[PDB]
Amino acid sequence: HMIKYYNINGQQVPVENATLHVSDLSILRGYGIFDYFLAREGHPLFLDDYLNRFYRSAAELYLEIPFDKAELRRQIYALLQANEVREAGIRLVLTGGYSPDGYTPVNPNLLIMMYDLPASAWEFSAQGIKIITHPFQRELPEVKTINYSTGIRMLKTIKERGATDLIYVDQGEWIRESARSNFFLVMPDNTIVTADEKILWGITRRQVIDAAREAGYAVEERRIHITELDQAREAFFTSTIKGVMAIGQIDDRVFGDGTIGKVTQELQDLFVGKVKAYLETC
Amino acid sequence: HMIKYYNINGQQVPVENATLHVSDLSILRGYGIFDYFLAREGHPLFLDDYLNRFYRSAAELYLEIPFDKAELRRQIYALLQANEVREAGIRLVLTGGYSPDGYTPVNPNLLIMMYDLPASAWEFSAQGIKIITHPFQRELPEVKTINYSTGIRMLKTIKERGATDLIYVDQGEWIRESARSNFFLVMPDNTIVTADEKILWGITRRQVIDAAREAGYAVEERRIHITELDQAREAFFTSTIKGVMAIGQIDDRVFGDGTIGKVTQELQDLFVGKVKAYLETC
């Protein structure tokens, strides 16, 4: 489970030597974007989707990625091989770079970090998790910025309350996403519902929506009023690491008996289907 | 104008060796706080006010600063002496630290960086600057976080438009501050007006409000409607580096003839008064 190397700016570097000078704008100014994906069987999953997002994120902050997509793909595969792993987490980071004035981007720094496949990845627990609502709206929500100020600061509140996560509700009226996951409801007629605006367009959310539609579920992408939690039978998260994770309780509302609902469970299987399908093209 | 040393975690380090490992949460997660102040005649200005803010900022993110205030003061003076400077900019940074999981703070990293006194510091130009309104509200506004995503991303828009700065207007209705300055109006009866909520409590703003009140101006701290720009005679910024800076135009509105108004000019002098007064106690 040893990771020997990261990559900074196209060079493989021993993990213990992977450092940035303190003039980096991520350090001074929280200025950067990132992406994160799994590799299984030697292959980053849905890699083209993740790379497209990373490139779009970067354009929205006016940061030039120093390599084209094919070259970045090569550095990622080479990093997998240098670390001798087939199953991994992979973090891409693009900082504002070393700035003259501690404010203006000049030259982004590109990081590629690697981890063991997270131990909890795709656990697919039958017992739903317990989350709280939190009134908040992420800034630049369609961009995967490095800014997790509120998300990280809320850990103490979450934990204090007996929860393990939250769902952000824009002005306490409109359901969005957690700090790190997209959020879905399943209605009693088996319509799946998820927000369409002022959220991060997850890659997992994409694959799950396509898989759902292919299975013959209706998926509405729309604004979601907080009151609509009381109409839902089921609730779940999507994310790279969670896959599809049942939510058993929100605040004082228990969904079902707290265990994974039937459509959520099918969506777990369909998601694994997408993964396999992807890996068949590799 | 050579700066030889920074300080990381209580050790003086040659500037070229001042680095953090990439697992630092400022890099991964934009998680950190900072402060910034000038030194003149060998003395950080209003140091106790800046330190109190840095300590309050840190508590709001649940980050423990590794030294008490007296010890931090000592490292700052020692850094001034190691660099052999009397006139400086000083940046304190407190990151989330090196985190196990790329998310949870464990041990903050403390940086102290130093610069030449900025060349533009307290320029006190007679010609006001030109700024645009921008609809936006900073998150965690009373905390001096490292997150300048919107501020930095707006540089291109600002510059594209012939402006050099912006003023954030919460939901386009309530005037707040720029990314880096507090904002004041002077009304035709010479009432000074500045926002009281959902802004950073600047140290400059403090000294200028106290100086104004001591001079016999009324200073209202209150919500400010956007329409109130049309009642104002004068507008200015306060910040560590600007001191008091005249704003000559906002969007299509010219204040006066574009040059510094009379109360703004007096406030510049009074601010310099506060600086001198401070330096007399050193």
Coordinates of C-alpha atoms in Angstrom, one line a residue:
Chain A
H1 CA 0.0 0.0 0.0
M2 CA 3.2 2.2 -0.4
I3 CA 2.9 5.1 -2.8
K4 CA 6.4 6.1 -3.7
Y5 CA 5.9 9.0 -6.2
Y6 CA 3.7 12.1 -7.0
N7 CA 4.1 14.3 -10.1
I8 CA 4.7 18.0 -10.0
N9 CA 4.7 19.9 -13.2
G10 CA 5.4 16.8 -15.3
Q11 CA 8.2 15.4 -13.1
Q12 CA 7.9 12.4 -10.9
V13 CA 9.1 13.2 -7.4
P14 CA 9.4 11.1 -4.3
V15 CA 6.4 11.8 -2.1
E16 CA 8.6 13.2 0.7
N17 CA 10.1 15.7 -1.7
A18 CA 6.8 16.9 -3.2
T19 CA 6.7 20.5 -2.0
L20 CA 5.6 23.9 -3.2
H21 CA 7.3 27.3 -2.4
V22 CA 5.1 29.3 0.0
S23 CA 4.5 32.0 -2.7
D24 CA 2.1 29.5 -4.4
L25 CA -1.3 31.2 -4.7
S26 CA -3.2 28.1 -3.3
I27 CA -1.3 28.8 0.0
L28 CA -1.7 32.6 0.0
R29 CA -5.1 33.0 -1.7
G30 CA -6.8 29.6 -1.9
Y31 CA -6.7 29.9 -5.7
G32 CA -6.8 26.7 -7.5
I33 CA -8.9 23.9 -9.0
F34 CA -8.7 20.1 -8.6
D35 CA -10.2 16.9 -9.7
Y36 CA -10.3 13.4 -8.1
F37 CA -11.0 10.0 -9.6
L38 CA -10.4 6.3 -8.9
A39 CA -8.4 3.8 -10.9
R40 CA -9.4 0.1 -11.0
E41 CA -7.7 -2.7 -13.0
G42 CA -5.0 -0.2 -13.9
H43 CA -7.4 2.3 -15.5
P44 CA -8.7 5.7 -14.3
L45 CA -12.4 5.5 -14.4
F46 CA -14.4 7.7 -16.8
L47 CA -11.1 9.5 -17.4
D48 CA -12.2 11.6 -20.4
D49 CA -15.2 13.0 -18.3
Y50 CA -12.9 13.9 -15.4
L51 CA -10.3 15.5 -17.6
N52 CA -12.9 17.5 -19.5
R53 CA -14.1 18.8 -16.1
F54 CA -10.6 19.6 -15.0
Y55 CA -9.9 21.5 -18.2
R56 CA -13.3 23.4 -17.9
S57 CA -12.6 24.2 -14.1
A58 CA -9.2 25.6 -15.1
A59 CA -10.6 27.8 -17.9
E60 CA -13.1 29.3 -15.4
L61 CA -10.3 30.5 -13.2
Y62 CA -8.2 31.6 -16.2
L63 CA -5.5 29.0 -15.3
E64 CA -3.6 27.4 -18.2
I65 CA -2.9 23.8 -17.7
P66 CA 0.7 23.3 -18.9
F67 CA 0.0 20.0 -20.8
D68 CA -2.7 19.0 -23.2
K69 CA -5.2 16.3 -22.3
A70 CA -3.3 13.5 -24.1
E71 CA -0.1 14.5 -22.3
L72 CA -1.8 14.7 -18.9
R73 CA -3.3 11.2 -19.5
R74 CA 0.2 10.0 -20.2
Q75 CA 1.5 11.4 -17.0
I76 CA -1.3 9.8 -15.0
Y77 CA -0.8 6.3 -16.5
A78 CA 3.0 6.7 -16.0
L79 CA 2.4 7.6 -12.4
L80 CA 0.3 4.5 -11.9
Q81 CA 3.1 2.4 -13.3
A82 CA 5.8 4.2 -11.3
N83 CA 3.8 3.5 -8.2
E84 CA 3.1 -0.2 -9.3
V85 CA -0.6 0.0 -8.5
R86 CA -3.7 -1.0 -10.3
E87 CA -6.3 0.2 -7.7
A88 CA -5.8 3.9 -6.7
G89 CA -7.2 7.3 -5.8
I90 CA -5.8 10.1 -8.0
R91 CA -5.9 13.8 -7.2
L92 CA -5.1 16.4 -9.8
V93 CA -4.5 19.9 -8.5
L94 CA -3.9 23.1 -10.5
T95 CA -2.9 26.0 -8.3
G96 CA -2.7 29.7 -9.2
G97 CA 1.0 29.2 -9.1
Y98 CA 4.0 31.2 -7.8
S99 CA 2.7 34.8 -8.1
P100 CA 4.9 38.0 -8.1
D101 CA 2.5 40.0 -6.0
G102 CA 0.8 37.4 -3.9
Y103 CA -2.4 37.9 -5.9
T104 CA -2.0 37.7 -9.7
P105 CA -1.6 34.3 -11.4
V106 CA 1.4 33.9 -13.7
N107 CA 2.1 30.2 -14.1
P108 CA -0.1 27.5 -12.5
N109 CA 1.4 24.6 -10.6
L110 CA 0.1 21.1 -11.6
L111 CA 0.1 18.4 -9.0
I112 CA -0.8 14.7 -9.5
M113 CA -1.1 12.9 -6.2
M114 CA -1.9 9.2 -5.6
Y115 CA -3.4 7.1 -2.8
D116 CA -4.5 3.6 -2.1
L117 CA -8.0 3.0 -3.2
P118 CA -10.0 4.5 -0.3
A119 CA -11.0 1.7 2.1
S120 CA -14.6 2.9 2.2
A121 CA -14.9 3.3 -1.6
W122 CA -18.2 1.9 -2.9
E123 CA -19.0 0.4 0.5
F124 CA -22.6 0.3 -0.5
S125 CA -23.8 0.0 3.1
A126 CA -27.4 -1.1 3.5
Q127 CA -27.7 1.2 6.5
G128 CA -28.3 4.8 5.4
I129 CA -26.2 7.6 6.8
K130 CA -27.5 10.5 8.9
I131 CA -27.1 14.0 7.7
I132 CA -28.2 17.5 8.7
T133 CA -29.5 20.3 6.5
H134 CA -27.3 23.4 6.5
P135 CA -28.3 26.8 4.9
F136 CA -25.5 27.7 2.5
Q137 CA -24.7 28.1 -1.2
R138 CA -21.2 27.3 -2.6
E139 CA -19.6 30.0 -4.7
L140 CA -18.7 29.2 -8.3
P141 CA -20.6 26.0 -7.9
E142 CA -20.0 24.6 -11.4
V143 CA -16.2 24.9 -10.9
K144 CA -14.3 22.3 -8.8
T145 CA -12.3 24.9 -6.8
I146 CA -10.0 24.0 -4.0
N147 CA -12.1 26.1 -1.6
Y148 CA -13.7 23.8 1.1
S149 CA -13.7 26.5 4.0
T150 CA -17.4 26.0 5.0
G151 CA -17.3 22.2 4.3
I152 CA -14.3 21.6 6.6
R153 CA -15.4 24.1 9.2
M154 CA -18.8 22.3 9.5
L155 CA -17.1 19.0 10.5
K156 CA -17.2 20.0 14.1
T157 CA -21.0 20.9 13.9
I158 CA -21.8 17.7 12.0
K159 CA -19.9 15.5 14.5
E160 CA -21.2 17.4 17.5
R161 CA -24.7 16.6 16.2
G162 CA -24.5 12.8 15.7
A163 CA -24.3 13.3 11.9
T164 CA -21.6 12.3 9.5
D165 CA -22.6 14.7 6.6
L166 CA -24.7 17.6 5.5
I167 CA -26.8 18.7 2.6
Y168 CA -26.5 22.4 1.7
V169 CA -29.9 24.3 1.2
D170 CA -29.5 27.5 -0.6
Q171 CA -31.1 30.2 1.6
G172 CA -32.6 27.3 3.5
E173 CA -35.1 26.9 0.6
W174 CA -33.3 25.1 -2.3
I175 CA -31.6 21.7 -2.0
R176 CA -28.2 21.5 -3.7
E177 CA -25.4 19.1 -2.7
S178 CA -23.1 18.3 0.2
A179 CA -19.5 19.7 0.3
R180 CA -18.3 16.6 -1.6
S181 CA -21.4 14.7 -3.1
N182 CA -24.4 15.3 -5.3
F183 CA -27.8 14.6 -3.7
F184 CA -30.9 12.8 -5.1
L185 CA -34.4 12.0 -4.0
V186 CA -36.6 9.1 -5.1
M187 CA -40.3 9.9 -5.1
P188 CA -43.1 7.4 -4.2
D189 CA -43.9 6.9 -7.9
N190 CA -40.1 6.2 -8.5
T191 CA -39.3 9.5 -10.2
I192 CA -35.7 10.3 -9.3
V193 CA -35.1 14.0 -8.6
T194 CA -31.9 16.0 -8.5
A195 CA -30.9 19.7 -8.7
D196 CA -29.9 21.1 -12.0
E197 CA -28.5 24.5 -11.1
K198 CA -25.8 26.0 -8.8
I199 CA -24.2 22.6 -8.1
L200 CA -21.1 20.8 -9.2
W201 CA -21.9 18.5 -12.2
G202 CA -20.5 15.3 -10.7
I203 CA -19.2 12.5 -12.9
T204 CA -20.9 10.0 -10.6
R205 CA -24.1 12.0 -10.9
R206 CA -23.8 11.8 -14.7
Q207 CA -23.3 8.0 -14.8
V208 CA -26.1 7.4 -12.3
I209 CA -28.5 9.6 -14.2
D210 CA -27.7 8.0 -17.5
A211 CA -27.9 4.5 -15.9
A212 CA -31.3 5.4 -14.3
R213 CA -32.7 6.7 -17.6
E214 CA -31.5 3.6 -19.4
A215 CA -33.2 1.5 -16.9
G216 CA -36.5 3.3 -17.6
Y217 CA -36.6 5.6 -14.6
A218 CA -37.7 9.2 -15.0
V219 CA -35.0 11.6 -13.7
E220 CA -36.0 15.2 -13.2
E221 CA -33.3 17.7 -13.1
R222 CA -34.9 20.7 -11.4
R223 CA -35.0 23.0 -8.4
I224 CA -35.9 21.1 -5.2
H225 CA -37.8 22.8 -2.4
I226 CA -36.8 21.7 1.2
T227 CA -40.4 20.8 1.8
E228 CA -40.1 18.1 -0.9
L229 CA -38.0 16.0 1.5
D230 CA -41.3 15.1 3.2
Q231 CA -42.7 13.7 -0.1
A232 CA -39.6 11.5 -0.9
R233 CA -39.4 7.8 -0.1
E234 CA -35.6 7.6 -0.6
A235 CA -32.6 9.9 -0.6
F236 CA -29.0 9.2 -1.6
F237 CA -25.6 10.8 -2.4
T238 CA -23.4 10.2 -5.4
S239 CA -19.7 10.9 -5.5
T240 CA -16.4 9.4 -6.8
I241 CA -15.7 7.6 -3.5
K242 CA -19.2 6.9 -2.4
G243 CA -20.6 5.7 -5.7
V244 CA -24.2 5.6 -4.6
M245 CA -24.8 5.9 -0.8
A246 CA -28.1 5.6 0.9
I247 CA -29.2 8.4 3.3
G248 CA -31.3 7.0 6.1
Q249 CA -32.1 10.2 7.9
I250 CA -32.1 13.9 7.3
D251 CA -32.5 16.0 10.5
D252 CA -35.5 14.4 12.3
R253 CA -36.8 12.6 9.2
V254 CA -36.1 8.9 8.8
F255 CA -36.3 7.6 5.2
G256 CA -38.1 4.3 5.2
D257 CA -36.7 2.4 8.2
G258 CA -33.2 4.0 7.7
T259 CA -32.0 1.2 5.4
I260 CA -31.3 1.6 1.7
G261 CA -34.4 2.0 -0.4
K262 CA -35.2 -0.2 -3.5
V263 CA -34.3 2.3 -6.2
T264 CA -31.1 3.4 -4.5
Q265 CA -30.1 -0.3 -4.3
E266 CA -30.8 -0.8 -8.0
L267 CA -28.8 2.4 -8.8
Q268 CA -25.8 1.0 -6.9
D269 CA -25.9 -2.1 -9.1
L270 CA -26.4 0.1 -12.3
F271 CA -23.5 2.2 -11.3
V272 CA -21.2 -0.8 -11.0
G273 CA -22.6 -1.7 -14.4
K274 CA -21.3 1.6 -15.8
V275 CA -17.9 1.0 -14.2
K276 CA -17.7 -2.5 -15.8
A277 CA -18.9 -1.2 -19.1
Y278 CA -16.2 1.5 -19.0
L279 CA -13.5 -1.0 -18.1
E280 CA -14.5 -3.2 -21.0
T281 CA -13.5 -0.3 -23.4
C282 CA -10.0 -0.4 -21.7
Chain B
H1 CA 15.5 45.6 -0.9
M2 CA 16.6 42.0 -0.3
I3 CA 14.5 39.8 2.0
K4 CA 16.7 36.9 3.1
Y5 CA 14.4 34.9 5.4
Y6 CA 10.8 33.8 6.1
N7 CA 9.7 31.9 9.2
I8 CA 7.9 28.6 9.0
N9 CA 6.6 27.1 12.3
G10 CA 9.0 29.1 14.4
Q11 CA 12.2 28.6 12.3
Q12 CA 13.8 31.1 10.2
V13 CA 14.3 29.7 6.7
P14 CA 16.1 31.1 3.6
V15 CA 13.3 32.4 1.4
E16 CA 14.3 29.9 -1.4
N17 CA 13.9 27.0 1.1
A18 CA 10.5 28.1 2.4
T19 CA 8.2 25.3 1.2
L20 CA 5.3 23.2 2.3
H21 CA 4.6 19.6 1.4
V22 CA 1.7 19.2 -1.0
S23 CA -0.5 17.5 1.6
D24 CA -1.0 20.9 3.3
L25 CA -4.7 21.7 3.4
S26 CA -4.2 25.2 2.0
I27 CA -3.1 23.6 -1.2
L28 CA -5.7 20.8 -1.3
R29 CA -8.7 22.5 0.3
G30 CA -8.0 26.3 0.4
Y31 CA -8.2 25.9 4.2
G32 CA -6.4 28.7 6.1
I33 CA -6.5 32.1 7.5
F34 CA -4.0 35.0 7.2
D35 CA -3.2 38.5 8.2
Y36 CA -1.1 41.3 6.7
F37 CA 0.4 44.5 8.2
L38 CA 3.1 47.1 7.6
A39 CA 6.1 47.8 9.7
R40 CA 7.5 51.3 9.8
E41 CA 10.5 52.6 11.9
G42 CA 11.1 49.0 12.9
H43 CA 7.6 48.4 14.3
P44 CA 4.6 46.5 13.0
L45 CA 1.7 49.0 13.0
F46 CA -1.2 48.4 15.4
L47 CA 0.2 45.1 16.0
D48 CA -2.1 44.1 18.9
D49 CA -5.2 44.7 16.7
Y50 CA -3.8 42.6 13.9
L51 CA -2.7 39.8 16.2
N52 CA -6.1 39.8 17.9
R53 CA -7.8 39.4 14.5
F54 CA -5.4 36.6 13.5
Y55 CA -6.2 34.7 16.7
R56 CA -9.9 35.3 16.2
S57 CA -9.8 34.2 12.5
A58 CA -7.9 31.1 13.6
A59 CA -10.5 30.2 16.3
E60 CA -13.3 30.5 13.7
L61 CA -11.7 27.8 11.6
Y62 CA -10.8 25.7 14.6
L63 CA -7.1 26.1 13.9
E64 CA -4.7 26.3 16.8
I65 CA -1.9 28.7 16.4
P66 CA 1.2 26.9 17.8
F67 CA 2.5 30.0 19.7
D68 CA 0.9 32.4 22.0
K69 CA 0.6 36.1 21.0
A70 CA 3.8 37.2 22.9
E71 CA 5.8 34.4 21.3
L72 CA 4.4 35.3 17.8
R73 CA 5.3 38.9 18.4
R74 CA 8.8 37.8 19.2
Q75 CA 9.1 35.8 16.0
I76 CA 7.9 38.8 14.0
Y77 CA 10.4 41.2 15.5
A78 CA 13.2 38.7 15.2
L79 CA 12.3 38.2 11.5
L80 CA 12.5 42.0 11.0
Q81 CA 16.0 42.0 12.5
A82 CA 17.1 38.9 10.6
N83 CA 16.1 40.6 7.4
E84 CA 17.7 44.0 8.6
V85 CA 14.7 46.0 7.6
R86 CA 12.7 48.8 9.4
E87 CA 10.1 49.3 6.6
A88 CA 8.2 46.1 5.5
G89 CA 5.1 44.3 4.6
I90 CA 4.4 41.2 6.8
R91 CA 2.1 38.3 5.9
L92 CA 1.1 35.8 8.5
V93 CA -0.5 32.6 7.2
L94 CA -2.0 29.8 9.2
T95 CA -2.9 26.8 7.0
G96 CA -5.1 23.8 7.8
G97 CA -1.8 21.9 7.9
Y98 CA -0.7 18.5 6.7
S99 CA -3.8 16.4 6.9
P100 CA -4.0 12.5 6.9
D101 CA -7.1 12.4 4.8
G102 CA -6.8 15.5 2.6
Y103 CA -9.7 17.1 4.5
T104 CA -9.4 17.0 8.3
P105 CA -7.1 19.5 10.0
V106 CA -4.6 18.0 12.4
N107 CA -1.7 20.5 13.0
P108 CA -1.8 24.0 11.3
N109 CA 1.3 25.3 9.5
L110 CA 2.3 28.9 10.5
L111 CA 4.1 31.0 7.9
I112 CA 5.6 34.5 8.4
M113 CA 6.6 36.1 5.1
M114 CA 8.1 39.5 4.6
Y115 CA 8.3 42.0 1.7
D116 CA 9.6 45.5 1.0
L117 CA 7.2 48.1 2.1
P118 CA 4.8 48.1 -1.0
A119 CA 5.8 50.9 -3.4
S120 CA 2.2 52.1 -3.6
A121 CA 1.6 52.0 0.2
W122 CA -0.2 55.2 1.3
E123 CA 0.2 56.8 -2.1
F124 CA -2.7 59.1 -1.2
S125 CA -3.3 60.0 -4.8
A126 CA -5.4 63.1 -5.4
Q127 CA -7.0 61.4 -8.4
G128 CA -9.7 58.9 -7.3
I129 CA -9.7 55.4 -8.7
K130 CA -12.4 53.9 -10.9
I131 CA -14.3 50.9 -9.8
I132 CA -17.3 48.8 -10.8
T133 CA -20.1 47.3 -8.7
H134 CA -20.2 43.5 -8.6
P135 CA -23.1 41.4 -7.1
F136 CA -21.5 39.1 -4.6
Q137 CA -21.2 38.3 -0.9
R138 CA -18.0 36.9 0.7
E139 CA -18.5 33.7 2.7
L140 CA -17.4 33.8 6.4
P141 CA -17.0 37.6 5.9
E142 CA -15.8 38.4 9.5
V143 CA -12.9 35.8 9.1
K144 CA -9.8 36.7 7.1
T145 CA -9.6 33.4 5.2
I146 CA -7.2 32.7 2.5
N147 CA -10.1 32.3 -0.1
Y148 CA -9.8 35.0 -2.8
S149 CA -11.4 32.9 -5.7
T150 CA -13.9 35.5 -6.8
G151 CA -11.6 38.4 -6.1
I152 CA -8.8 37.0 -8.2
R153 CA -11.1 35.7 -10.9
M154 CA -12.7 39.2 -11.3
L155 CA -9.3 40.8 -12.2
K156 CA -9.8 40.0 -15.9
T157 CA -13.4 41.6 -15.8
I158 CA -12.1 44.6 -13.9
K159 CA -9.2 45.2 -16.2
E160 CA -11.3 44.5 -19.3
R161 CA -13.7 47.2 -18.2
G162 CA -11.2 50.1 -17.6
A163 CA -11.5 49.7 -13.8
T164 CA -8.8 48.9 -11.3
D165 CA -11.1 47.6 -8.5
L166 CA -14.6 46.6 -7.5
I167 CA -17.1 47.0 -4.7
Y168 CA -19.1 43.9 -3.8
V169 CA -22.9 44.5 -3.5
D170 CA -24.7 41.7 -1.6
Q171 CA -27.5 40.5 -3.9
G172 CA -26.9 43.7 -5.9
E173 CA -28.7 45.5 -3.0
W174 CA -26.3 46.0 -0.1
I175 CA -22.9 47.6 -0.3
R176 CA -20.1 45.7 1.5
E177 CA -16.4 46.0 0.7
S178 CA -13.9 45.1 -2.1
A179 CA -12.0 41.8 -2.1
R180 CA -9.2 43.6 -0.1
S181 CA -10.6 46.9 1.3
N182 CA -13.4 48.4 3.4
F183 CA -15.6 50.9 1.7
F184 CA -17.0 54.3 2.9
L185 CA -19.3 57.0 1.7
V186 CA -19.3 60.6 2.8
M187 CA -22.7 62.3 2.6
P188 CA -23.3 65.9 1.7
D189 CA -23.8 66.8 5.4
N190 CA -20.4 65.2 6.1
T191 CA -21.8 62.1 7.8
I192 CA -19.5 59.2 7.0
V193 CA -21.2 55.9 6.3
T194 CA -19.8 52.4 6.3
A195 CA -21.3 48.9 6.4
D196 CA -21.5 47.2 9.8
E197 CA -22.4 43.6 8.9
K198 CA -21.1 40.8 6.7
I199 CA -17.8 42.5 6.1
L200 CA -14.2 42.0 7.3
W201 CA -13.6 44.4 10.3
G202 CA -10.5 46.1 8.9
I203 CA -7.8 47.4 11.2
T204 CA -7.5 50.5 8.9
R205 CA -11.3 50.9 9.0
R206 CA -11.1 50.9 12.8
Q207 CA -8.4 53.5 13.0
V208 CA -10.2 55.7 10.4
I209 CA -13.5 55.5 12.2
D210 CA -12.0 56.3 15.5
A211 CA -10.0 59.2 14.0
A212 CA -13.1 60.5 12.2
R213 CA -15.2 60.4 15.4
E214 CA -12.4 62.1 17.4
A215 CA -12.4 64.9 14.8
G216 CA -16.1 65.4 15.3
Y217 CA -17.5 63.6 12.3
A218 CA -20.6 61.4 12.7
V219 CA -19.8 57.9 11.5
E220 CA -22.8 55.6 10.9
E221 CA -22.2 51.9 10.8
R222 CA -25.2 50.5 9.0
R223 CA -26.5 48.7 6.0
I224 CA -26.0 50.8 2.8
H225 CA -28.4 50.5 -0.1
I226 CA -26.9 50.7 -3.6
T227 CA -29.2 53.7 -4.4
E228 CA -27.3 55.6 -1.7
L229 CA -24.3 55.9 -4.0
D230 CA -26.4 58.7 -5.7
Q231 CA -26.7 60.7 -2.5
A232 CA -23.0 60.5 -1.5
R233 CA -20.5 63.3 -2.2
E234 CA -17.5 61.2 -1.6
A235 CA -16.4 57.6 -1.6
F236 CA -13.2 55.9 -0.4
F237 CA -11.5 52.6 0.5
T238 CA -9.5 51.7 3.6
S239 CA -6.9 49.0 3.8
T240 CA -3.5 48.2 5.3
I241 CA -1.7 49.1 2.0
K242 CA -4.0 51.8 0.7
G243 CA -4.5 53.6 4.0
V244 CA -7.3 55.9 2.7
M245 CA -7.8 56.0 -1.0
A246 CA -10.2 58.2 -2.9
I247 CA -12.7 56.6 -5.3
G248 CA -13.4 59.0 -8.2
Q249 CA -15.9 56.9 -10.0
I250 CA -18.2 53.9 -9.5
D251 CA -19.6 52.5 -12.8
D252 CA -21.0 55.6 -14.6
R253 CA -21.0 57.8 -11.5
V254 CA -18.3 60.4 -11.0
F255 CA -17.8 61.5 -7.5
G256 CA -17.1 65.3 -7.5
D257 CA -14.8 65.9 -10.4
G258 CA -13.0 62.6 -9.8
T259 CA -10.4 64.0 -7.4
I260 CA -10.3 63.3 -3.7
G261 CA -13.0 65.0 -1.7
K262 CA -12.4 67.2 1.3
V263 CA -13.4 64.7 4.1
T264 CA -11.4 61.9 2.4
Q265 CA -8.4 64.1 2.3
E266 CA -8.7 65.0 6.0
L267 CA -9.1 61.3 6.8
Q268 CA -5.8 60.6 5.1
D269 CA -4.1 63.1 7.4
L270 CA -5.9 61.7 10.4
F271 CA -4.9 58.2 9.5
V272 CA -1.3 59.3 9.3
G273 CA -1.9 60.8 12.7
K274 CA -3.0 57.5 14.2
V275 CA 0.1 55.9 12.7
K276 CA 2.4 58.5 14.3
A277 CA 0.5 58.2 17.6
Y278 CA 1.0 54.4 17.5
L279 CA 4.7 54.8 16.7
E280 CA 5.1 57.2 19.7
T281 CA 4.1 54.4 22.0
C282 CA 7.0 52.2 20.5

